[PDB]
Amino acid sequence: DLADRFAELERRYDARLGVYVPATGTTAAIEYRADERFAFCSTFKAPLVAAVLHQNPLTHLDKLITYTSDDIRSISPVAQQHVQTGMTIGQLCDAAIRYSDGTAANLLLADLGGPGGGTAAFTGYLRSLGDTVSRLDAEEPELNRDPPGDERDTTTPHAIALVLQQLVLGNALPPDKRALLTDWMARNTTGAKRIRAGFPADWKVIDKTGTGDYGRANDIAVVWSPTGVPYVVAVMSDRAGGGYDAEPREALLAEAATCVAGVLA
Numbered sequence: 640d641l642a643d644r645f646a647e648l649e650r651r652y653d654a655r656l657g658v659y660v661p662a663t664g665t666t667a668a669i670e671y672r673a674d675e676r677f678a679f680c681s682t683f684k685a686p687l688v689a690a691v692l693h694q695n696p697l698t699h700l701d702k703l704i705t706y707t708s709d710d711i712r713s714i715s716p717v718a719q720q721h722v723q724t725g726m727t728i729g730q731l732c733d734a735a736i737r738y739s740d741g742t743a744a745n746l747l748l749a750d751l752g753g754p755g756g757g758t759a760a761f762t763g764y765l766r767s768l769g770d771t772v773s774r775l776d777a778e779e780p781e782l783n784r785d786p787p788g789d790e791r792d793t794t795t796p797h798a799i800a801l802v803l804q805q806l807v808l809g810n811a812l813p814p815d816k817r818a819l820l821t822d823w824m825a826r827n828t829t830g831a832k833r834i835r836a837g838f839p840a841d842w843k844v845i846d847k848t849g850t851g852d853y854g855r856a857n858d859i860a861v862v863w864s865p866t867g868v869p870y871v872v873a874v875m876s877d878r879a880g881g882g883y884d885a886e887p888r889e890a891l892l893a894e895a896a897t898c899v900a901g902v903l904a
């Protein structure tokens with residue numbers, strides 16, 4: 640049925656596809672390799688912002704953090720323009736979500752403190768939401784480079800979709816803080832050609848992307864039908880058959896999204 644098209648898309652692009660849509664009151668759950676482990680990549684930056692907000696009052700957003708050029712390890716379109724001025728935590732939240740800024744994600748992890756530069760505290764945050772499967776061990780850019788089969792810095796479409804459901808649709812955050820997280824994801828600038836490109840234009844899409852080596856390309860989203868019904872969609876992919884230098888395929892994540900839309904309609 641639907642698993643034959645996902646398995647078909649896997650064949651067309653030479654990839655491994657993981658899909659999960661948590662069931663609503665009227666629609667059942669969509670699952671394709673939903674419980675297989677995939678690599679977080681940049682998708683952790685969205686629930687990471689929720690950890691910082693959950694721990695501190697809104698006044699913490701105005702605290703300024705200064706850094707040096709030696710701290711810039713990865714793609715950081717915004718952090719590279721502020722080495723002399725510094726950035727406040729709120730701006731680091733903005734950069735980490737809407738621009739996938741890697742340095743801003745590393746600084747926010749250090750704000751969580753603790754061993755591993757904050758990775759153990761971040762894993763602790765996911766456990767508080769009920770996720771006992773996911774784990775973050777390294778920072779940018781090392782967390783995108785773990786070999787296949789290595790369970791470090793991994794999650795599942797099942798686990799990540801339910802985490803995002805609580806932050807956007809649930810009560811994981813108070814309403815004022817919940818408003819800040821959704822707005823940033825709503826004005827994200829990196830996902831134009833993935834889940835957004837698969838749904839019709841009159842469906843609202845907010846998302847956070849992820850990309851790494853071994854052809855890894857992820858997108859996590861909450862979408863709204865024209866009538867206003869919300870759905871959470873997790874799509875993850877890798878192409879380990881082509882090794883470290885595998886080229887990611889954004890078209891695979893658009894096709895899979897369209898398949899999901901034809902079922903939810």
Ligand SMILES: CO/N=C(\C(=O)N[C@@H]1C(=O)N2C(C(=O)O)=C(CSc3nc(=O)c(=O)[nH]n3C)CS[C@H]12)c1csc(N)n1
Nearest residue numbers: 716717720721733734737738824825826827828829830831
């Ligand atoms: C939703 O994204 N769509 C985009 C897009 O990527 N736009 C960006 C976005 O959100 N932008 C923002 C900002 O962060 O506010 C800005 C702010 S840029 C900026 N403001 C400052 O105050 C400053 O000191 N320095 N800089 C550089 C404008 S473009 C961009 C787009 C590009 S072409 C097109 N048709 N759409």
